[PDB]
Amino acid sequence: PAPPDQKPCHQLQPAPYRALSESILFGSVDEERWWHSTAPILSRLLISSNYDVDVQYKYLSLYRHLVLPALGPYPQRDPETGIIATQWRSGMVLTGLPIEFSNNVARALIRIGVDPVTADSGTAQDPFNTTRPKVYLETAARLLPGVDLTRFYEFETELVITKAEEAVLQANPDLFRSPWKSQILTAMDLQKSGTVLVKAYFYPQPKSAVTGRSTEDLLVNAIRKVDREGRFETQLANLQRYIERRRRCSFFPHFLSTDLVEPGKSRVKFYASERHVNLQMVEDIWTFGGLRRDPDALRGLELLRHFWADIQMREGYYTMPRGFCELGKSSFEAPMMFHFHLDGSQSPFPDPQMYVCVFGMNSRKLVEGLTTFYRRVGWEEMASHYQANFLANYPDEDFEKAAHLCAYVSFAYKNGGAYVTLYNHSFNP
Amino acid sequence: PAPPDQKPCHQLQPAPYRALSESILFGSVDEERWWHSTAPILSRLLISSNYDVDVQYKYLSLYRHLVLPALGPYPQRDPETGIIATQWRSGMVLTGLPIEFSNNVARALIRIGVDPVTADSGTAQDPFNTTRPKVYLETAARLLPGVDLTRFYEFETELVITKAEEAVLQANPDLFRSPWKSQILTAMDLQKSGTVLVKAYFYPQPKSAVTGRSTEDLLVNAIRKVDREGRFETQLANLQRYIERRRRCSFFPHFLSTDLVEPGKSRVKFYASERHVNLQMVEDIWTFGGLRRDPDALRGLELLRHFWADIQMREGYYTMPRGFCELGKSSFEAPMMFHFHLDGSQSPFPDPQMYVCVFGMNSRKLVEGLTTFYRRVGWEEMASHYQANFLANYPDEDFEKAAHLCAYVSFAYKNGGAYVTLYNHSFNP
Ligand SMILES: O=C1N[C@@H](Cc2c[nH]c3ccccc23)C(=O)N2CCC[C@@H]12
Ligand SMILES: O=C1N[C@@H](Cc2c[nH]c3ccccc23)C(=O)N2CCC[C@@H]12
Ligand SMILES: CC(C)=CCSP(=O)(O)OP(=O)(O)O
Ligand SMILES: CC(C)=CCSP(=O)(O)OP(=O)(O)O
Ligand SMILES: [Cl-]
Ligand SMILES: [Cl-]
Ligand SMILES: [Cl-]
Ligand SMILES: [Cl-]
């Protein structure tokens, strides 16, 4: 795999952000304030990732038209405590913001994570945010080519609560006490060509609470019922057997995601979170208890050990946090995560990808450690320029204390090479 | 004056038009259809005029946000006659469309002429379109820097009908039988820097009908009352004396326009239309009956005679047309026009600029004649490329018969050089 592009871009107001800012009439104060707090970051990310200028303008305009109205009310600041937060605490980011730009620094690709909300999201009128994410994906579908919602509707029927089930949770609040109430999250992959690849994520914990069925059973039955051809069957069964092995438990099945394209050629990812955050546990998961030890699998594990050591990952046993850590309060530990890529290929085991929660760790120190890894795998442009670009996104900030600028970092081994993505703070007040 | 830039651009779908088209969510079918019928033309014009890419995107986005909603209902086509037209017949273009892109081919600058309308414009609810142009200019004012509405409000008070005066015209339709009902028109000059220069035009013929005051008296008293400092006094008086001379009549005072900037440093243009369209009449107007014959004035007149002969202007006596010539019916004669630039300078006479109505003349033949003039004044890039660019704006068209693609051509002598602007059809069904 060729090394990723990385151009420096530290401008407070990138040219494309200015050109659009001077031309847009907003019909909402919220949209206008969201734009100015997040558009500069997105514009820098696209310039540093070396997207074409035409494509930069397409995606910033798309951000303006499609995303801004889906962000709902602009976050409000507490005069006393100084905590900046929205009413709806999104399960997409530990800050609780409905927007996140992630950076695939292996390919120099940018993705827009969005949790579509309204003014009523979280209140008594819409306590689990059931409708708006669907409307968002329907709007995206009509606008963007190749977006097939077939997979979304099938998983939505099976993993999202109905009107009747919602009334039960409203009438009996004690049945679901978790602050993480997002059922559906979204992501748009921004390709270099101009094509946008849309993904949906389903968190069935509310459905699990009402129906009395575990998260594992909800996800597996969902995947199995949707998989008419039986393409995911072998890999799903061996994942179940690994989950069965770990049960006989810190390995928790959590959620899934699906690409929105041709159903017979679409792929599902199964996510689980692990509490024991150490390299011994990682090998066990990465190799399925030693069953998956082919050359590609082992070479990936060896590079994972370097990645782990370079970023100075602190090992420990971490549970799911008590609550959110909003922008303003002190930063923190949480469980690591793994997705398993049900790719429908010939392989017996689904492709694993590790996510480590770095929220709580010094962000400047993490990126310096990441630079060490960039030099290890020979990503010259990225090693030289990424750090200065990451920090440039947060001008008025103390990097000596800031531990919220990167929440998660992901690691996978694809096509004989490291695949790394940073999930970063995407908001400047 | 340096020669104008002109790059070739014949693409059916220019890149910036595509990038935005693939990213915009329209809240109106009308806006969406206007965009696709006019945005390709604007994008080509900006590329051929050699605007920077950042500035292209600013102005296309500005077009989308500010202009599209001001165009009102998309034009409808008669199934039998094939005539495509809007309910409101705008006095800005002989086709009756509320949008026109003009090309200052002397400087390679593009201007957006707009007649802001709504669904109610022309009907019994708003028969003279009084409110929407004001709202448009107020919206533009807040969005765009340097836009001072002081001149607009003063001329609006004096030249636009009040609510009471409107009721009189509604109650008695025979008091104003003219199809040209636009009182306020607008224009945005697109500078190369990114700055937009906004202008307002006031046609006081409805005010003249109700108040019983002539168009001449309405305009002059307006200019004189607004001109507190007395900067326009000398030039206005000598224009009045020329109008007085011509009265003792085919020279008709018609309307005025004003830039929207610092009031004490803003400039007014006085427009009059002439029925006798011949070179002998042009010299008389251009020289104020022989009073203005300084070297700059005479050199300009000599070049005007070449311009006149190159485009093959047919001489004659032409009155104001009986009605509009909408897109679909056969093309035609009409009076020529002159603006007089009350510049507030030391000069005794205001700077004249000629407008010739070329609507009715073969547009391909006119542009070929214009190319001859471009070669005469040494505009090499413009001579080589303009014709192919003009025609590229109308793909599915018979140029053998088409006489509506250019409505007016303007001529002035500025800074020892020819100043030419084409006012062109800006719509593709
Ligand atoms: O903040 C969270 N993020 C997601 C994953 C994610 C990160 N970036 C995303 C972008 C799109 C979809 C999902 C994600 C999640 O599952 N979490 C469980 C614990 C904390 C919480
Ligand atoms: O079609 C017309 N155009 C304007 C001038 C104009 C041309 N392009 C413009 C752009 C902005 C403002 C004014 C204009 C006008 O005064 N006319 C009188 C006779 C026909 C009618
Ligand atoms: C950060 C978390 C938990 C999930 C995001 S998965 P993603 O869609 O960003 O990763 P891919 O593009 O599928 O490799
Ligand atoms: C075509 C007619 C009658 C008027 C337009 S005047 P304009 O504002 O386009 O010309 P300038 O930019 O003032 O020289
Ligand atoms: Cl339902
Ligand atoms: Cl640390
Ligand atoms: Cl009034
Ligand atoms: Cl002819």
PDB file of N, CA, C and O in Angstrom, chain B residues 46-89:
ATOM      1  N   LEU B  46     -17.646  32.773 -15.649  1.00  0.00           N
ATOM      2  CA  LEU B  46     -16.608  33.060 -14.658  1.00  0.00           C
ATOM      3  C   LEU B  46     -15.272  32.390 -14.996  1.00  0.00           C
ATOM      4  O   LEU B  46     -14.208  32.936 -14.700  1.00  0.00           O
ATOM      5  N   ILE B  47     -15.327  31.210 -15.611  1.00  0.00           N
ATOM      6  CA  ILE B  47     -14.115  30.505 -16.029  1.00  0.00           C
ATOM      7  C   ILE B  47     -13.474  31.198 -17.233  1.00  0.00           C
ATOM      8  O   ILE B  47     -12.258  31.400 -17.261  1.00  0.00           O
ATOM      9  N   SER B  48     -14.293  31.568 -18.218  1.00  0.00           N
ATOM     10  CA  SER B  48     -13.799  32.255 -19.414  1.00  0.00           C
ATOM     11  C   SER B  48     -13.286  33.662 -19.102  1.00  0.00           C
ATOM     12  O   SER B  48     -12.334  34.125 -19.726  1.00  0.00           O
ATOM     13  N   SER B  49     -13.908  34.330 -18.133  1.00  0.00           N
ATOM     14  CA  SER B  49     -13.443  35.640 -17.670  1.00  0.00           C
ATOM     15  C   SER B  49     -12.221  35.560 -16.739  1.00  0.00           C
ATOM     16  O   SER B  49     -11.728  36.591 -16.275  1.00  0.00           O
ATOM     17  N   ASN B  50     -11.752  34.343 -16.459  1.00  0.00           N
ATOM     18  CA  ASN B  50     -10.526  34.103 -15.687  1.00  0.00           C
ATOM     19  C   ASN B  50     -10.592  34.582 -14.230  1.00  0.00           C
ATOM     20  O   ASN B  50      -9.629  35.145 -13.704  1.00  0.00           O
ATOM     21  N   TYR B  51     -11.735  34.355 -13.586  1.00  0.00           N
ATOM     22  CA  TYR B  51     -11.852  34.532 -12.139  1.00  0.00           C
ATOM     23  C   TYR B  51     -11.117  33.392 -11.450  1.00  0.00           C
ATOM     24  O   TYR B  51     -11.044  32.284 -11.987  1.00  0.00           O
ATOM     25  N   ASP B  52     -10.584  33.658 -10.260  1.00  0.00           N
ATOM     26  CA  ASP B  52      -9.963  32.610  -9.446  1.00  0.00           C
ATOM     27  C   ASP B  52     -11.002  31.565  -9.049  1.00  0.00           C
ATOM     28  O   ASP B  52     -12.190  31.872  -8.942  1.00  0.00           O
ATOM     29  N   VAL B  53     -10.544  30.337  -8.818  1.00  0.00           N
ATOM     30  CA  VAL B  53     -11.435  29.223  -8.499  1.00  0.00           C
ATOM     31  C   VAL B  53     -12.179  29.458  -7.180  1.00  0.00           C
ATOM     32  O   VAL B  53     -13.373  29.197  -7.093  1.00  0.00           O
ATOM     33  N   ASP B  54     -11.483  29.966  -6.167  1.00  0.00           N
ATOM     34  CA  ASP B  54     -12.129  30.313  -4.896  1.00  0.00           C
ATOM     35  C   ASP B  54     -13.275  31.304  -5.107  1.00  0.00           C
ATOM     36  O   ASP B  54     -14.348  31.154  -4.519  1.00  0.00           O
ATOM     37  N   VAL B  55     -13.037  32.308  -5.950  1.00  0.00           N
ATOM     38  CA  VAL B  55     -14.029  33.348  -6.240  1.00  0.00           C
ATOM     39  C   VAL B  55     -15.186  32.821  -7.095  1.00  0.00           C
ATOM     40  O   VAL B  55     -16.326  33.262  -6.931  1.00  0.00           O
ATOM     41  N   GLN B  56     -14.899  31.891  -8.007  1.00  0.00           N
ATOM     42  CA  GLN B  56     -15.956  31.220  -8.773  1.00  0.00           C
ATOM     43  C   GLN B  56     -16.951  30.567  -7.821  1.00  0.00           C
ATOM     44  O   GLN B  56     -18.167  30.720  -7.972  1.00  0.00           O
ATOM     45  N   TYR B  57     -16.423  29.839  -6.841  1.00  0.00           N
ATOM     46  CA  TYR B  57     -17.256  29.094  -5.902  1.00  0.00           C
ATOM     47  C   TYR B  57     -18.019  30.011  -4.952  1.00  0.00           C
ATOM     48  O   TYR B  57     -19.143  29.699  -4.574  1.00  0.00           O
ATOM     49  N   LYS B  58     -17.414  31.136  -4.576  1.00  0.00           N
ATOM     50  CA  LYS B  58     -18.101  32.137  -3.764  1.00  0.00           C
ATOM     51  C   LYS B  58     -19.328  32.699  -4.484  1.00  0.00           C
ATOM     52  O   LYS B  58     -20.382  32.853  -3.880  1.00  0.00           O
ATOM     53  N   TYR B  59     -19.183  33.002  -5.771  1.00  0.00           N
ATOM     54  CA  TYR B  59     -20.255  33.642  -6.537  1.00  0.00           C
ATOM     55  C   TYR B  59     -21.350  32.677  -6.979  1.00  0.00           C
ATOM     56  O   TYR B  59     -22.511  33.073  -7.099  1.00  0.00           O
ATOM     57  N   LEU B  60     -20.990  31.423  -7.229  1.00  0.00           N
ATOM     58  CA  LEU B  60     -21.988  30.397  -7.533  1.00  0.00           C
ATOM     59  C   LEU B  60     -22.794  30.049  -6.284  1.00  0.00           C
ATOM     60  O   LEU B  60     -24.010  29.852  -6.355  1.00  0.00           O
ATOM     61  N   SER B  61     -22.115  29.982  -5.142  1.00  0.00           N
ATOM     62  CA  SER B  61     -22.787  29.735  -3.869  1.00  0.00           C
ATOM     63  C   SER B  61     -23.668  30.927  -3.492  1.00  0.00           C
ATOM     64  O   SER B  61     -24.779  30.748  -2.998  1.00  0.00           O
ATOM     65  N   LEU B  62     -23.169  32.137  -3.737  1.00  0.00           N
ATOM     66  CA  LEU B  62     -23.950  33.356  -3.530  1.00  0.00           C
ATOM     67  C   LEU B  62     -25.180  33.362  -4.436  1.00  0.00           C
ATOM     68  O   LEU B  62     -26.276  33.714  -4.004  1.00  0.00           O
ATOM     69  N   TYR B  63     -24.992  32.976  -5.696  1.00  0.00           N
ATOM     70  CA  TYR B  63     -26.114  32.845  -6.629  1.00  0.00           C
ATOM     71  C   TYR B  63     -27.168  31.904  -6.044  1.00  0.00           C
ATOM     72  O   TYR B  63     -28.346  32.245  -5.990  1.00  0.00           O
ATOM     73  N   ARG B  64     -26.726  30.739  -5.576  1.00  0.00           N
ATOM     74  CA  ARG B  64     -27.619  29.745  -4.977  1.00  0.00           C
ATOM     75  C   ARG B  64     -28.387  30.300  -3.777  1.00  0.00           C
ATOM     76  O   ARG B  64     -29.596  30.113  -3.674  1.00  0.00           O
ATOM     77  N   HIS B  65     -27.684  30.975  -2.872  1.00  0.00           N
ATOM     78  CA  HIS B  65     -28.289  31.421  -1.616  1.00  0.00           C
ATOM     79  C   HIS B  65     -29.139  32.684  -1.759  1.00  0.00           C
ATOM     80  O   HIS B  65     -30.246  32.758  -1.218  1.00  0.00           O
ATOM     81  N   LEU B  66     -28.626  33.665  -2.494  1.00  0.00           N
ATOM     82  CA  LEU B  66     -29.233  34.996  -2.544  1.00  0.00           C
ATOM     83  C   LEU B  66     -30.184  35.174  -3.729  1.00  0.00           C
ATOM     84  O   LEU B  66     -31.267  35.733  -3.573  1.00  0.00           O
ATOM     85  N   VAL B  67     -29.786  34.694  -4.902  1.00  0.00           N
ATOM     86  CA  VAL B  67     -30.516  34.994  -6.135  1.00  0.00           C
ATOM     87  C   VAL B  67     -31.660  34.028  -6.423  1.00  0.00           C
ATOM     88  O   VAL B  67     -32.771  34.461  -6.721  1.00  0.00           O
ATOM     89  N   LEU B  68     -31.395  32.728  -6.331  1.00  0.00           N
ATOM     90  CA  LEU B  68     -32.390  31.713  -6.692  1.00  0.00           C
ATOM     91  C   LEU B  68     -33.776  31.940  -6.067  1.00  0.00           C
ATOM     92  O   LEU B  68     -34.782  31.841  -6.771  1.00  0.00           O
ATOM     93  N   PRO B  69     -33.841  32.246  -4.755  1.00  0.00           N
ATOM     94  CA  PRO B  69     -35.164  32.490  -4.152  1.00  0.00           C
ATOM     95  C   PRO B  69     -35.825  33.786  -4.632  1.00  0.00           C
ATOM     96  O   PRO B  69     -37.048  33.909  -4.571  1.00  0.00           O
ATOM     97  N   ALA B  70     -35.018  34.731  -5.106  1.00  0.00           N
ATOM     98  CA  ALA B  70     -35.513  36.002  -5.637  1.00  0.00           C
ATOM     99  C   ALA B  70     -36.062  35.904  -7.069  1.00  0.00           C
ATOM    100  O   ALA B  70     -36.704  36.837  -7.548  1.00  0.00           O
ATOM    101  N   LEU B  71     -35.812  34.789  -7.752  1.00  0.00           N
ATOM    102  CA  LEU B  71     -36.309  34.599  -9.115  1.00  0.00           C
ATOM    103  C   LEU B  71     -37.773  34.168  -9.158  1.00  0.00           C
ATOM    104  O   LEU B  71     -38.405  34.227 -10.213  1.00  0.00           O
ATOM    105  N   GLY B  72     -38.311  33.728  -8.024  1.00  0.00           N
ATOM    106  CA  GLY B  72     -39.716  33.347  -7.941  1.00  0.00           C
ATOM    107  C   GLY B  72     -40.025  32.102  -8.756  1.00  0.00           C
ATOM    108  O   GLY B  72     -39.153  31.256  -8.942  1.00  0.00           O
ATOM    109  N   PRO B  73     -41.272  31.981  -9.248  1.00  0.00           N
ATOM    110  CA  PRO B  73     -41.691  30.807 -10.024  1.00  0.00           C
ATOM    111  C   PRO B  73     -40.896  30.588 -11.314  1.00  0.00           C
ATOM    112  O   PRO B  73     -40.668  31.527 -12.073  1.00  0.00           O
ATOM    113  N   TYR B  74     -40.492  29.343 -11.544  1.00  0.00           N
ATOM    114  CA  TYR B  74     -39.812  28.940 -12.768  1.00  0.00           C
ATOM    115  C   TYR B  74     -40.757  29.162 -13.949  1.00  0.00           C
ATOM    116  O   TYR B  74     -41.964  28.980 -13.803  1.00  0.00           O
ATOM    117  N   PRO B  75     -40.222  29.559 -15.121  1.00  0.00           N
ATOM    118  CA  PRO B  75     -41.117  29.863 -16.237  1.00  0.00           C
ATOM    119  C   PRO B  75     -41.862  28.633 -16.754  1.00  0.00           C
ATOM    120  O   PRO B  75     -41.320  27.528 -16.740  1.00  0.00           O
ATOM    121  N   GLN B  76     -43.097  28.838 -17.199  1.00  0.00           N
ATOM    122  CA  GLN B  76     -43.951  27.752 -17.671  1.00  0.00           C
ATOM    123  C   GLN B  76     -44.113  27.837 -19.181  1.00  0.00           C
ATOM    124  O   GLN B  76     -44.102  28.929 -19.750  1.00  0.00           O
ATOM    125  N   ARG B  77     -44.259  26.680 -19.825  1.00  0.00           N
ATOM    126  CA  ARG B  77     -44.337  26.612 -21.280  1.00  0.00           C
ATOM    127  C   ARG B  77     -45.760  26.320 -21.748  1.00  0.00           C
ATOM    128  O   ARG B  77     -46.422  25.415 -21.235  1.00  0.00           O
ATOM    129  N   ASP B  78     -46.211  27.094 -22.730  1.00  0.00           N
ATOM    130  CA  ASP B  78     -47.505  26.888 -23.369  1.00  0.00           C
ATOM    131  C   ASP B  78     -47.406  25.655 -24.278  1.00  0.00           C
ATOM    132  O   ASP B  78     -46.554  25.619 -25.165  1.00  0.00           O
ATOM    133  N   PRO B  79     -48.263  24.638 -24.057  1.00  0.00           N
ATOM    134  CA  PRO B  79     -48.213  23.437 -24.904  1.00  0.00           C
ATOM    135  C   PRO B  79     -48.474  23.686 -26.396  1.00  0.00           C
ATOM    136  O   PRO B  79     -47.863  23.028 -27.240  1.00  0.00           O
ATOM    137  N   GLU B  80     -49.365  24.624 -26.712  1.00  0.00           N
ATOM    138  CA  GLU B  80     -49.733  24.911 -28.102  1.00  0.00           C
ATOM    139  C   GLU B  80     -48.715  25.817 -28.804  1.00  0.00           C
ATOM    140  O   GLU B  80     -48.098  25.414 -29.791  1.00  0.00           O
ATOM    141  N   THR B  81     -48.544  27.034 -28.292  1.00  0.00           N
ATOM    142  CA  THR B  81     -47.679  28.036 -28.930  1.00  0.00           C
ATOM    143  C   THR B  81     -46.187  27.795 -28.684  1.00  0.00           C
ATOM    144  O   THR B  81     -45.347  28.222 -29.479  1.00  0.00           O
ATOM    145  N   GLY B  82     -45.861  27.127 -27.580  1.00  0.00           N
ATOM    146  CA  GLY B  82     -44.470  26.849 -27.222  1.00  0.00           C
ATOM    147  C   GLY B  82     -43.766  28.006 -26.534  1.00  0.00           C
ATOM    148  O   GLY B  82     -42.550  27.964 -26.342  1.00  0.00           O
ATOM    149  N   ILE B  83     -44.523  29.032 -26.149  1.00  0.00           N
ATOM    150  CA  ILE B  83     -43.948  30.225 -25.529  1.00  0.00           C
ATOM    151  C   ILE B  83     -43.618  29.960 -24.062  1.00  0.00           C
ATOM    152  O   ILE B  83     -44.498  29.617 -23.270  1.00  0.00           O
ATOM    153  N   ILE B  84     -42.342  30.113 -23.715  1.00  0.00           N
ATOM    154  CA  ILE B  84     -41.873  29.951 -22.343  1.00  0.00           C
ATOM    155  C   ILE B  84     -41.781  31.325 -21.688  1.00  0.00           C
ATOM    156  O   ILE B  84     -41.061  32.197 -22.177  1.00  0.00           O
ATOM    157  N   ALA B  85     -42.511  31.515 -20.590  1.00  0.00           N
ATOM    158  CA  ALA B  85     -42.560  32.812 -19.918  1.00  0.00           C
ATOM    159  C   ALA B  85     -43.001  32.695 -18.464  1.00  0.00           C
ATOM    160  O   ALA B  85     -43.639  31.714 -18.073  1.00  0.00           O
ATOM    161  N   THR B  86     -42.650  33.705 -17.672  1.00  0.00           N
ATOM    162  CA  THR B  86     -43.114  33.820 -16.293  1.00  0.00           C
ATOM    163  C   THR B  86     -44.353  34.704 -16.244  1.00  0.00           C
ATOM    164  O   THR B  86     -44.613  35.468 -17.174  1.00  0.00           O
ATOM    165  N   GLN B  87     -45.115  34.591 -15.159  1.00  0.00           N
ATOM    166  CA  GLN B  87     -46.292  35.436 -14.936  1.00  0.00           C
ATOM    167  C   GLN B  87     -45.896  36.911 -14.890  1.00  0.00           C
ATOM    168  O   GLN B  87     -46.529  37.747 -15.530  1.00  0.00           O
ATOM    169  N   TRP B  88     -44.852  37.218 -14.123  1.00  0.00           N
ATOM    170  CA  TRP B  88     -44.300  38.570 -14.070  1.00  0.00           C
ATOM    171  C   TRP B  88     -43.370  38.791 -15.259  1.00  0.00           C
ATOM    172  O   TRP B  88     -42.389  38.067 -15.422  1.00  0.00           O
ATOM    173  N   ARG B  89     -43.689  39.780 -16.089  1.00  0.00           N
ATOM    174  CA  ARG B  89     -42.834  40.158 -17.208  1.00  0.00           C
ATOM    175  C   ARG B  89     -41.882  41.252 -16.736  1.00  0.00           C
ATOM    176  O   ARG B  89     -42.271  42.411 -16.598  1.00  0.00           O
TER     177      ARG B  89
END
